[PDB]
Ligand binder design. Structure first.
Ligand SMILES: Nc1nc2c(ncn2[C@@H]2O[C@H](COP(=O)(O)OP(=O)(O)OP(=O)(O)O)[C@@H](O)[C@H]2O)c(=O)[nH]1
Ligand SMILES: Nc1ncnc2c1ncn2[C@@H]1O[C@H](COP(=O)(O)OP(=O)(O)CP(=O)(O)O)[C@@H](O)[C@H]1O
Ligand SMILES: Nc1nc2c(ncn2[C@@H]2O[C@H](COP(=O)(O)OP(=O)(O)O)[C@@H](O)[C@H]2O)c(=O)[nH]1
Ligand SMILES: [Ca+2]
Ligand SMILES: [Ca+2]
Ligand SMILES: [Ca+2]
Ligand SMILES: [Mg+2]
Ligand SMILES: [Mg+2]
Ligand SMILES: [Mg+2]
Lengths: 352, 424, 437, 54
């Protein structure tokens, strides 16, 4: 009889994991402050890692990796990529980015302007995007002046990165999109890619001559269901799944999702996770960690994959909650606390 | 040397006390004549906790036998180990207490209490560093209950900084002598709430159910119940009679077990309870039984309340690693019955010397809020009679006023409330 | 030559002290009777080992140690044990009854009545010193004497010896070998009143020692003897520089200079390697790089925490045995590129290194295997704040209900001292956060 | 990677390796504390004795 606690009531993913654990009749939920637990579904912010692994005779497991925020924070990700030798500043799958602190507070203001002036002088497309972790507040502009003045009006750190002016547009619709991948990292640091992904497509045709209307440029599931007028037209909820997106690539481009896109995605996931492994691995620690990540990718018209961001507390597509949450229990929890296929995950092997 | 002075008062107190010295005298290799004849130095390690050493290597128990009638102590003197007790330590009157708390506490008892204190003072003065006192008595009679609590109050006045510990037999209608037992027990409980640091609640109802149902004894006698008490008293005092770090003396026990001054009433438990008696008992089996209500001497269901603190003692040659494993398996598999605001409130101790005739045993000491069930039974039986003032004339005839009963009633109902609030 | 006086308080301090002086004698070739053949100056001299041993005309080498316990059963082990002859009666101080795991009972009630006797016995040792450096105080956090009397002793020592350094070796409470539910109360109470009086304190978590004993020594259920022998090796590694010829940490002042830039943050994390079972067939001798890399594995730290998520303020490497500076710098370079070693911006990213050629001595019949080389890293990480967080949390759970508080008030302590002590720990946790985040 | 302050003796040697440059109560006040606690203890015992005397 295993025991677990719940400290993030707003997590839909682990709400289903909690429900599933009880269904097995072999897991018992305790109050959120009972220290005698086998498993912790912890909070998003200020999870007390320092208190885990000190209960005699209790193998304790938490559903977060201490230190993984270095990857799931806008500015942190940029700093990690530019400074880590494994990724280098020449990393070819991450858009050119710069950390910019508002003037009312190192900073990369002048280094961004130097690259900006070079593009402007070279007649090249010089459109950038400004965003931060304190957003729902995003600004797409081609003038460096508007971008910097927008960050100063705020008070938190922002990142300015190149805007992919040549996105791959699905037809019919001539509409942008992004790809979400769910990746589970277990206590042994095996990297598991959920076989099922989702494309959060824009229902509005991509308009390169107007970055003011941010409905055809931002493919967030919330912006498409609030400010978009063609929501749910082409696909149910602006969510295309791999089976449809794959057939499309065969009919239109004469390629598959595996060869044209998935190879690069798997490469990016490995690079990012393998980079921080020494910093966050719990191999020789008094407690164990696993965590579910949400990787967001962009695809340009050359079928090149780009990394947009990594989410440390991701939600799931409604249609995929059941299968995924069952997969978390199977490989992440029960792998440590066994119970009295055809795996849904694609194991990304690597050197430890 | 850190000595404990033992006192036994009344019929129940002296009969149970007699068996206690019988059992531990055997464990420490002392024979009925006070001569050591053991075969291990661990027996004499802490021998002076309960025994004085006289001339000729004689060990005389530091025990004071008290009663208001000579009957029971005459039995003890003629009993198995009766010769071992210091003849000067017998203090008794002739009137008796008539199962009357007022007589033991205010009239007959008052006339004898100073002579008991004289012997207590004599035993204390011969102590290197007196730990405190332990008293065996029932709460349903007159002498052990009324004079017993009078002794404690006067012992506390003279030794305000010593630990006061009691083994208190609570009355039950299933094993009753008189209908006034709820009166005597409720008056006594208020005394113990104020003047004892530790009280092992020994419920005669639980001792009966164990003998009837578990031990399969058709008609239990007082001797049968006392066998369980003798064994329980030996277990809970093991940490005091042999070397060790956990609950080694009375004050350290009190510090670990008592989070709030008034909530110092413990549920003791023992294992095994076998009636198929030669089978070896495994550590998993000791732990399961020791925590099972059917092994509790207080007739309370721990699943109805929560453990504030728990002390466990394992005796014999066993897997100390397998002990920690099973102990940690009971807590991690039933943590809903342990308060989460006292971290690591379950302590375990191991002693190599097992009880006589057992390869290994386990003694349980719980400070559970479920004990309020015991004080609820007494309170209800008390109110059922007191509301009609039944049998009160036995007490008003000794100088008591109804007001003193009313205040005892409130005091024990407050105690129940205090237990209830920490269970939530 | 400047003398160091060791003070052992309570059961933990006395039993750990007993194990250390056993090891000290084996390391310096001192016999149980107190005779040191290799010492050629009879009844005198100012060698390096003389910082811990005085000498009698008869050539006896006497530890500069005071043992203090409020109850006599433990100190009687010393009076009748193997090394009984080393000490004289004036050094072993015992009372009648202990502090019952009650800080207030050891600091106030009993402490007030024996403090002047303890200072007197310490003064007798200080009078034998031509240049006393200060004191080494061994004690537990959880015991009533270790916590209660120690903090009083540290206050008086600051008064009577205002210019002398004071270092602590403190045993952090672990439930697996603990005997008291109130040890979190005692830990925080004693840390609060001792903070401003200690220059450098080495915390040893019994939980860490316990697991090292089960994992590396294959002791299924370690005892205090197993724990203390391992603890005395680490202590010996830390004090070796005071007892042998050298240039690193040659006086107590150098510990604070090299390890404590901020006075309140004076709790260096200790890591030791290798720990090899004596029953093992025959272990492959680990190299300088391997035992050095081991100094960044959480499983070999004296306190379980994660230095990867803190910042270093100082870092000392203390090697004993076959080690040469070339192999140390080689390993260090290799580790910087493999480990997450983040220093504070206001502290140089450097390592102070000490090498003593004499390999670690092991007690005959002990549990530790003889190894050719070993290292003890002393590093001041903010990551050790995890130990304060854990402890403060347990304190909060009980104090919110005032559980067990009446025992302390009953000894004369005011309830406000609880919150005063807890608020000081809250500030201590904030200081760690300001430095490492 | 710089080595400084190297010192060698018969029994060992020490040095420093730099990898990167940077960027009380008086005796009287103690007696008062101890005596105030002893006074609260005496006071509490007097209240117990007063209670017992009643
Ligand atoms: N490592 C180690 N820890 C010990 C030892 N002895 C006791 N402890 C720990 O110290 C704590 C209890 O403190 P003690 O030193 O025994 O108590 P004390 O200082 O003698 O004070 P009182 O007994 O209350 O008067 C517990 O956490 C024990 O686990 C020891 O010899 N070695
Ligand atoms: N450099 C870039 N080039 C092109 N489009 C970009 C871009 N950066 C962001 N976007 C657009 O913004 C959307 C993602 O925004 P972003 O992920 O930065 O905000 P967010 O983190 O609040 C959403 P999520 O829930 O995925 O975390 C994508 O749909 C993408 O089309
Ligand atoms: N367990 C046990 N209970 C007893 C014994 N003798 C009496 N009692 C109980 O004690 C109460 C009677 O008190 P008793 O000790 O005989 O009166 P006293 O002599 O005035 O103290 C009743 O509840 C009895 O059930 C005994 O030997 N063993
Ligand atoms: Ca008369
Ligand atoms: Ca000499
Ligand atoms: Ca000072
Ligand atoms: Mg995001
Ligand atoms: Mg009777
Ligand atoms: Mg002690």
């Amino acid at each position: 009889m295993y025991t677990f606690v719940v400290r993030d009531e707003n997590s839909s993913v682990y709400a289903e994991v909690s429900r599933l654990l009880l269904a097995t009749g072999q897991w018992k939920r305790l109050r959120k402050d009972n220290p005698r637990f086998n498993l912790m579904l912890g909070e998003r912010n200020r999870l007390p890692f320092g208190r885990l692994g000190h209960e005699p005779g209790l193998v304790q497991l938490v559903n977060y990796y201490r230190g993984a925020d270095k990857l799931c924070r806008k500015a942190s990700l940029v700093k990690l990529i530019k400074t880590s030798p494994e990724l280098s500043e020449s990393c070819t799958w991450f858009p050119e980015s710069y950390v910019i602190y508002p003037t009312n507070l190192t900073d990369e203001r002048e280094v961004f302007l130097a690259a900006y002036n070079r593009r402007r002088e070279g007649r090249e497309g010089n459109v950038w995007i400004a965003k931060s972790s304190a957003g729902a507040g995003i600004l797409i502009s081609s003038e460096a002046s508007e971008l910097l003045d927008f960050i100063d009006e705020q008070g938190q750190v922002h990142v300015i990165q190149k805007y992919l002016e040549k996105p791959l547009l699905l037809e019919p619709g001539h509409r942008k999109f992004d790809i979400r991948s769910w990746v589970l990292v277990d206590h042994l640091y095996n990297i598991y890619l959920y076989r099922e992904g989702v494309l959060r497509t824009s229902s509005e045709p991509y308009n390169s001559a107007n970055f003011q209307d941010k409905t055809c440029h931002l493919t967030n599931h919330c912006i498409q269901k609030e400010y978009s007028k063609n929501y749910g037209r082409y696909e149910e909820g602006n969510e295309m799944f791999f089976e449809e997106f794959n057939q499309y690539l065969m009919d239109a481009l004469n390629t598959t999702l595996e060869n044209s896109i998935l190879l690069q995605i798997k490469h990016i996931i490995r690079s990012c996770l393998m980079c921080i492994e020494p910093a966050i691995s719990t191999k020789h620690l008094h407690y164990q960690s696993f965590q579910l990540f949400g990787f967001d990718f962009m695809v340009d018209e050359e079928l090149k994959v780009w990394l947009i961001e990594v989410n440390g507390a991701p939600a799931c597509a409604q249609k995929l909650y059941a299968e995924l949450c069952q997969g978390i229990v199977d490989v992440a929890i029960s792998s440590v606390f066994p119970l009295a296929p055809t795996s849904i995950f694609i194991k990304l092997h690597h050197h430890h | 040397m850190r000595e404990i002075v033992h006192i036994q008062a009344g019929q129940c107190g002296n009969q149970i006390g007699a068996k206690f010295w019988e059992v531990i005298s055997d464990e420490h290799g002392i024979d009925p004549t006070g001569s050591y004849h053991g075969d291990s130095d661990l027996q004499l390690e802490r021998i002076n906790v309960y025994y004085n050493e006289a001339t000729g290597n004689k060990y005389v128990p530091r025990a004071i036998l008290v009663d208001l009638e000579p009957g029971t102590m005459d039995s003890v003197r003629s009993g198995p180990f009766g010769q071992i007790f210091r003849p000067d330590n017998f203090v008794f009157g002739q009137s008796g207490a008539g199962n009357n708390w007022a007589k033991g506490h205010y009239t007959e008892g008052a006339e004898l209490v100073d002579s008991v204190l004289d012997v207590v003072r004599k035993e204390s003065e011969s102590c290197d560093c007196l730990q405190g006192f332990q008293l065996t008595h029932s709460l349903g009679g007159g002498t052990g209950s009324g004079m017993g609590t009078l002794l404690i109050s006067k012992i506390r006045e003279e030794y305000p900084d010593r630990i006061m510990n009691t083994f208190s037999v609570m009355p039950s209608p299933k094993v009753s002598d008189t209908v006034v037992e709820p009166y005597n027990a409720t008056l006594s409980v208020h005394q113990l709430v104020e003047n004892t640091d530790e009280t092992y609640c020994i419920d005669n109802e639980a001792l009966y159910d164990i003998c009837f149902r578990t031990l399969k004894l058709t008609t239990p006698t007082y001797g049968d119940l006392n066998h369980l008490v003798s064994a329980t008293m030996s277990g809970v005092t093991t940490c005091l009679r042999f070397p060790g770090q956990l609950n080694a003396d009375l004050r350290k026990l009190a510090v670990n077990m008592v989070p709030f001054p008034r909530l110092h009433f413990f549920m003791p438990g023992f294992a095994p309870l076998t009636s198929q008696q030669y089978r070896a008992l495994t550590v998993p089996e000791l732990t399961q039984q020791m925590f099972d209500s059917k092994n509790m001497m207080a007739a309370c269901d721990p699943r109805h309340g929560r453990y504030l603190t728990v002390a466990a003692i394992f005796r014999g040659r066993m897997s100390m690693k397998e002990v920690d494993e099973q102990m940690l398996n009971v807590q991690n598999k039933n943590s809903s019955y342990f308060v989460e605001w006292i971290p690591n409130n379950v302590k375990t101790a191991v002693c190599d010397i097992p009880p006589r005739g057992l390869k290994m045993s386990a003694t349980f000491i719980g400070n559970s809020t479920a004990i309020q069930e015991l004080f609820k039974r007494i309170s209800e039986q008390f109110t059922a009679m007191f509301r009609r003032k039944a049998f009160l004339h036995w007490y008003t005839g000794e100088g008591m006023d109804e007001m003193e009963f009313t205040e005892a009633e409130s005091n024990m109902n407050d105690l129940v409330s205090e237990y209830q609030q920490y269970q939530d | 030559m400047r003398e160091c006086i060791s003070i052992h308080v309570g059961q933990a301090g006395v039993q750990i002290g007993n194990a250390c002086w056993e090891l000290y004698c084996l390391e310096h070739g001192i016999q149980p009777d107190g005779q040191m053949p290799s010492d050629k100056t009879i009844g005198g001299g100012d060698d390096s080992f003389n910082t811990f041993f005085s000498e009698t005309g008869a050539g006896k080498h006497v530890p500069r140690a005071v043992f203090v316990d409020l109850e006599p059963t433990v100190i009687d082990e010393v009076r009748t044990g193997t090394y009984r002859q080393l000490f004289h009666p004036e050094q072993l101080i015992t009372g009648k009854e202990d502090a019952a795991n009650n800080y207030a009972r050891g600091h106030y009630t009993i402490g007030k009545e024996i403090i002047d006797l303890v200072l007197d016995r310490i003064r007798k040792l200080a009078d034998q010193c031509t240049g006393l450096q200060g004191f080494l105080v061994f004690h537990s956090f959880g015991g009533g004497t270790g916590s209660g009397f120690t903090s009083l002793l540290m206050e008086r020592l600051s008064v009577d010896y205002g210019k002398k350094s004071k270092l602590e070796f403190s045993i952090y409470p672990a439930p697996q070998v603990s005997t008291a539910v109130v040890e979190p109360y005692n830990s925080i109470l004693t840390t609060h009143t001792t903070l401003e009086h200690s220059d450098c304190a080495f915390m040893v978590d019994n939980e860490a020692i316990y697991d090292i004993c089960r994992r590396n020594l294959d002791i299924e259920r370690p005892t205090y003897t197993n724990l203390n022998r391992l603890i005395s090796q680490i202590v010996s590694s830390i004090t070796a520089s005071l007892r042998f010829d050298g240039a690193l940490n040659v006086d107590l002042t150098e510990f604070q200079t090299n390890l404590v830039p901020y006075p309140r943050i004076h709790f260096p994390l200790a890591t030791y390697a290798p720990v090899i079972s004596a029953e093992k067939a025959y272990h492959e001798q680990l190299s300088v790089a391997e035992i050095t890399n081991a100094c960044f594995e959480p499983a070999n730290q004296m306190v379980k925490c994660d230095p990867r998520h803190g910042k270093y303020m100082a870092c000392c490497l203390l090697y004993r045995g076959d080690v040469v500076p070339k192999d140390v710098n080689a390993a260090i370079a290799t580790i910087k590129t493999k480990r997450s070693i983040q220093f504070v911006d206001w502290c140089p990213t450097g390592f102070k290194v000490g090498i003593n050629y004499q390999p670690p001595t092991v007690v005959p019949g002990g549990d530790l295997a003889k190894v050719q080389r070993a290292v003890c890293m002393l590093s001041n990480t903010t990551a050790i704040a995890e130990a304060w967080a854990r402890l403060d949390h347990k304190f909060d759970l009980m104090y919110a209900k005032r559980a067990f508080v009446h025992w302390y008030v009953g000894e004369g302590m005011e309830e406000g001292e609880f919150s005063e002590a807890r608020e000081d720990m809250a500030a201590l946790e904030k200081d760690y956060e300001e430095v490492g985040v | 990677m710089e080595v400084i302050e190297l010192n060698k003796c018969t029994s060992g040697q020490s040095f420093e390796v730099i990898l990167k440059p940077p960027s009380d109560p008086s005796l009287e006040e103690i007696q008062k504390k101890l005596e105030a606690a002893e006074e609260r203890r005496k006071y509490q015992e007097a209240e117990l004795l007063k209670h017992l005397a009643e």
